[PDB]
Design a protein around this nucleic acid. Sequence first.
DNA 1: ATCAATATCCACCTGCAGATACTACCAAAAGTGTATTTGGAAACTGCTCCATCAAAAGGCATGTTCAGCTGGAATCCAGCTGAACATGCCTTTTGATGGAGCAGTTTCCAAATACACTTTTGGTAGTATCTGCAGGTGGATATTGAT
DNA 2: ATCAATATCCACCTGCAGATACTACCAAAAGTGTATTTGGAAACTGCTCCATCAAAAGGCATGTTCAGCTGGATTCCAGCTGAACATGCCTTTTGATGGAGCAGTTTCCAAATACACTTTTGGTAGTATCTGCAGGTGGATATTGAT
Lengths: 82, 87, 97, 94, 106, 105, 99, 99
Amino acid sequence: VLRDNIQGITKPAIRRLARRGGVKRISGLIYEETRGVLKVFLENVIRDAVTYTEHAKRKTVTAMDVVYALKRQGRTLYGFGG
Amino acid sequence: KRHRKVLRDNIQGITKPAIRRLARRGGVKRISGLIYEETRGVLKVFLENVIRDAVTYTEHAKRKTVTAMDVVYALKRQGRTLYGFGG
Amino acid sequence: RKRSRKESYSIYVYKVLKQVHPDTGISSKAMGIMNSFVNDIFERIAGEASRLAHYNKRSTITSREIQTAVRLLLPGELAKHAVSEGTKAVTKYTSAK
Amino acid sequence: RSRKESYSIYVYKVLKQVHPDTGISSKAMGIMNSFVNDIFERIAGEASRLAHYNKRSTITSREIQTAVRLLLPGELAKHAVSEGTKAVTKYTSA
Amino acid sequence: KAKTRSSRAGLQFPVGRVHRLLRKGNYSERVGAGAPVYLAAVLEYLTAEILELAGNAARDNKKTRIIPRHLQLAIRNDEELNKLLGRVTIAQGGVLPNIQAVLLPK
Amino acid sequence: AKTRSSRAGLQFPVGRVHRLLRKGNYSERVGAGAPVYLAAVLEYLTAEILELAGNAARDNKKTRIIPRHLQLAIRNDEELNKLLGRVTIAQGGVLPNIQAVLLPK
Amino acid sequence: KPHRYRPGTVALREIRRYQKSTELLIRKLPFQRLVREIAQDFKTDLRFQSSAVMALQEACEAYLVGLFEDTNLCAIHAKRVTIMPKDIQLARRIRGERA
Amino acid sequence: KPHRYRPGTVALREIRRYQKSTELLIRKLPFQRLVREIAQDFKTDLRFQSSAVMALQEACEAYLVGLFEDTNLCAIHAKRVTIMPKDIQLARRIRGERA
DNA sequence: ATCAATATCCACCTGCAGATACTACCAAAAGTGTATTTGGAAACTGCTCCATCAAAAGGCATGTTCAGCTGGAATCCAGCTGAACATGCCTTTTGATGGAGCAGTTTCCAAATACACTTTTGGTAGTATCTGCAGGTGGATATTGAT
DNA sequence: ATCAATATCCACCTGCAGATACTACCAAAAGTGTATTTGGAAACTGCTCCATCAAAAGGCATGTTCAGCTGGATTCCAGCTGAACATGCCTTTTGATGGAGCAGTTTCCAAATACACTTTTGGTAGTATCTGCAGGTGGATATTGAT
Ligand SMILES: [Mn+2]
Ligand SMILES: [Mn+2]
Ligand SMILES: [Mn+2]
Ligand SMILES: [Mn+2]
Ligand SMILES: [Mn+2]
Ligand SMILES: [Mn+2]
Ligand SMILES: [Mn+2]
Ligand SMILES: [Mn+2]
Ligand SMILES: [Mn+2]
Ligand SMILES: [Mn+2]
Ligand SMILES: [Mn+2]
Ligand SMILES: [Mn+2]
Ligand SMILES: [Mn+2]
Ligand SMILES: [Mn+2]
């Protein structure tokens, strides 16, 4: 079946994320709203990561590219180097 | 030999009309009675944190005078960058 | 005793102002703001270029580091034009002597 | 092949000193490495700006101290300063 | 006769000063000749962009002299300058006129 | 030869901290005391987290510290949480916390 | 009558379950699929380290969970127990992620 | 018969007035005493450049105005027009000033 | 809709704070030129680890039904909060004085960089032994929700 | 209150992925010793500007009265979202397998640094003189609110 990739982020998975966020009851429009927010996040982070990849003249996005990108966005991440 | 009077309770110098005016610039139309004391508390914390950092810069440079740059540097590291007073 | 020289970008800001708005002046306080702006953006770009070079074990900050720094720092159109203005200035510079 | 430095064996040393019979997974060791690197960068960076602000070309223990006070919350800063002063004192005498 | 590196680059902003500030700032061991040129161009371009928009705000307000208020108006009304300077306070700049619709009478 | 770490009474590597400072472009010069002080502060902070994470491991009836234990240690500590407030710990999860108004009855 | 839990009972059960664990909550492959698609718009024919993708999913999930917490507070602030787009938007606005 | 503007009319007039101007809204000398009192509690015998005090006041007023903006959105979110302490607290929690 | 009270507008003007102008001066800055050193680009290539492949296995996502209960709409009303007024205080403004301390210049040595050489160590690679605990089982019992 | 249906917990057990203890190898890194350089602490002091002074006055804070209309409580009900169940679809596993490309090594030159010397310039500094517009007035237009 034809399927967009952001729709691969399923309603039950978004539900579980909300649960860990302490959310008890979820409105129907939340799932599309979340996918849009998710997409902007990844776009911002990956854009910066790829920019580090290009500068290093590589074709492979490394974990360090991602970690450096996240630090720029004020989303510092422990556990993957750096 | 003589020292200035004791400084106390100056947070009340942040008057109710001064807080109303600030709320107006912030687009606020109606203000609950308990806002004024809440705001004073919030301001004192903000001021304390910035001044503490500024004075730390001052002491490090072995000065007795807090400069505009001490404040600017303090604001920058608190993530409240300020244009118009120095470097 | 002469008070030491305090450098600013004022005369350069002023030149660009006249290029852009020949009949417009600027107050000292506003010039103060512009000076803070240029210094701030300088440090941001230079800082990003520094990390960049360190991540890649390079000891030299070149125009290429500056360019990637500008792309990381500036949003959309501002980046596009900054990069273009930057590249143009370097090509012109190297084409002399 | 080239070598990759980490703080792993020093983290492990400090662990056995505070919890002699406690282990640490490799993933958890990765987090600790990220932590030490992060705090190093923050303190070093702050000390750098301090030296620059004061037209200094040398980062000394004094800059490291002011940087620690700026970056760490109250009690963590107090103990860190104390630990720092202690280590420089003993290093001077040893 | 000598040429400034700025004139050689076709720039108003000082290439030489920017080069010195780069070396003096402990950003790297070495600084290439192209680096201060590129950086001076970017700084000049951004200065031009802000002064252009501020000059318009001044004109819009029947003024010939740019003041901090005009700089703030130009920045907060431009989406990209606003993003670049989202964590910046312009002293004596005030805020944009903005009243939430629900606060209006009807 | 006696290492500077030993000479300072530290487990953390003073020689490495010094080299990292020099090559980091933080300043032109580095006083001999700076890497000692900094190595000590880093060792102390490391000890503080490992203590608390160790306790958290005990509380969960484990002998081996995993990322979850580090997360519990930091978020349950007012000062460590503030210090690492803009930091995410991989595979750390979150603290058990349910808003009162969501509880039944 | 066959057994049936009241609405909200199982939800609270899920909260306790997932706040206890640390495992990722988005399926790996669909996420991996999404990452490559977005990256393709910035640069073509990229490859990814496996750790790079995992670093992204950890960062992304920790972000959404944190956002959901703030969103929950906004819903409760308006005397609701149901989160709405209204709540996400307010949280992101105040966070400074927009407007 | 003595003229009265309705409740809220003058408030809106004041919003338009102060959003149009740039002058400081806290009195100068009282703010200076507050700064001196607070600094004195941290370190005795300090002096202040006049521009240092003004820099602090510019920062404090810009901080409070911005906070009152977020506070206003929190009140409107609760279908209120009146800002309350819990609005300020919500805004500061989401900002990460108390979280 | 009419009208009256008041805010808002805008042209007009005048005093002056602050912007502009000029010369003089010069220390630092910037540029030139020559010699010397080297970072990193280029080319080749070995080995890590990434992409893809098959191929079940089944766990988990999707679609449907039903109804509990939440969100939102409507209604009421006590009393909070805004608008206006009278009173007069303390912030603002203007100007001056003493001197605290910031800052500019010079001398000087403790400490740092710079090499050369020796010794130590942490990262490594196989190689083999060990173990904390995930995950499965059963059965106790706690919780939830029907009466 | 009873009582049935699930969820949840505790104790115990076992396979194994991942931790560990080991020996050996080695490039880099840290320590040592010597020569050289130099940052910045001292000392001295010129001079900015900070703290404090007085004195006059009006902008603005304080406090009160009054009641408009907002927030909060209450009720009510349509329908939205949770729970449960039945499918079946595709994520997952893992294992092998090319081979892309990261990364290590060698070569070498375009460009960087160091340095000595010459020139240009931007920053006070001291006066001297325009000029944009703040803030005052006055009168015409607009807004708000009662009727
Ligand atoms: Mn006190
Ligand atoms: Mn080389
Ligand atoms: Mn019904
Ligand atoms: Mn309800
Ligand atoms: Mn009074
Ligand atoms: Mn003195
Ligand atoms: Mn060893
Ligand atoms: Mn188990
Ligand atoms: Mn010297
Ligand atoms: Mn009434
Ligand atoms: Mn209402
Ligand atoms: Mn190849
Ligand atoms: Mn000149
Ligand atoms: Mn006017």
